[PDB]
N, CA, C and O atoms as a Maestro MAE file, in Angstrom:
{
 s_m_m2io_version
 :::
 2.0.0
}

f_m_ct {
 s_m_title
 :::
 protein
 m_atom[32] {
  # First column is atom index #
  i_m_mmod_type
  r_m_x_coord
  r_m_y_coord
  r_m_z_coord
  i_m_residue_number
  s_m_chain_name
  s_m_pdb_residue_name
  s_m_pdb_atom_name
  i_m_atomic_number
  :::
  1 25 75.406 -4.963 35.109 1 A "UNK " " N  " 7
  2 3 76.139 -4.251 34.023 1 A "UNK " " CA " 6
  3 2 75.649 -2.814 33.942 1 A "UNK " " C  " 6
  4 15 74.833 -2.433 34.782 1 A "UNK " " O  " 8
  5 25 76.082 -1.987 32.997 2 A "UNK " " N  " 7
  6 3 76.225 -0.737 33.109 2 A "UNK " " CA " 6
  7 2 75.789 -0.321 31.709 2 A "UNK " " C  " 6
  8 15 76.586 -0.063 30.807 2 A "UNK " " O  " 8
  9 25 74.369 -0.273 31.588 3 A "UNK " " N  " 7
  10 3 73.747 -0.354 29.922 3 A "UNK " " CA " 6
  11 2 73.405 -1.354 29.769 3 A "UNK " " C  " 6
  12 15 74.360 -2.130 29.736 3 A "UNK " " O  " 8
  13 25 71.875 -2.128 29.560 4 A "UNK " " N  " 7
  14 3 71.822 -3.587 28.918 4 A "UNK " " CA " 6
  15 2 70.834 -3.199 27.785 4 A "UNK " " C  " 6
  16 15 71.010 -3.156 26.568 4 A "UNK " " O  " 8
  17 25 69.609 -2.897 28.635 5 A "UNK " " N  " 7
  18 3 68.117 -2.811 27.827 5 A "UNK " " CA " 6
  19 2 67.471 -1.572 28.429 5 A "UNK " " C  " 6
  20 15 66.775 -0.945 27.631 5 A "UNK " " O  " 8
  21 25 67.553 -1.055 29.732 6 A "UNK " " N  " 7
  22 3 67.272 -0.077 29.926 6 A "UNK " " CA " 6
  23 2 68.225 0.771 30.615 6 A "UNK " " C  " 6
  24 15 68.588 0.622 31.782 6 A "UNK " " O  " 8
  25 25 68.589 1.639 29.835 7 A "UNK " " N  " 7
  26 3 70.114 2.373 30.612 7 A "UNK " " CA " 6
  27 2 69.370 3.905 30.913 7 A "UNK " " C  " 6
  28 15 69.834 4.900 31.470 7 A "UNK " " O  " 8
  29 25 68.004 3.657 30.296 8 A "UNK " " N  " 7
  30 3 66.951 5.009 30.548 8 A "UNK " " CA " 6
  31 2 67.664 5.589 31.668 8 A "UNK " " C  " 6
  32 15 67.248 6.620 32.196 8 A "UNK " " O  " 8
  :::
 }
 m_bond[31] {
  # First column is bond index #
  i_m_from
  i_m_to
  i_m_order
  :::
  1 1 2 1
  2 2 3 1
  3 3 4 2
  4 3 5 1
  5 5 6 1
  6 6 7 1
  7 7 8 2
  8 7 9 1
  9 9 10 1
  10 10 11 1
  11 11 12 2
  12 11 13 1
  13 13 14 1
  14 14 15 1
  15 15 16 2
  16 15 17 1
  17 17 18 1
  18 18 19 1
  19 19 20 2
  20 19 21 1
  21 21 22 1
  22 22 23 1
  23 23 24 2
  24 23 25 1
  25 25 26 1
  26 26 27 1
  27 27 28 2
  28 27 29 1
  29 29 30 1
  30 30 31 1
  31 31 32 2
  :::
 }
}
């Protein structure tokens, strides 16, 4: 996916 928990 594309953003979850680290999209840092």
């Amino acid at each position: 996916f594309s953003x979850l928990a680290l999209c840092a």
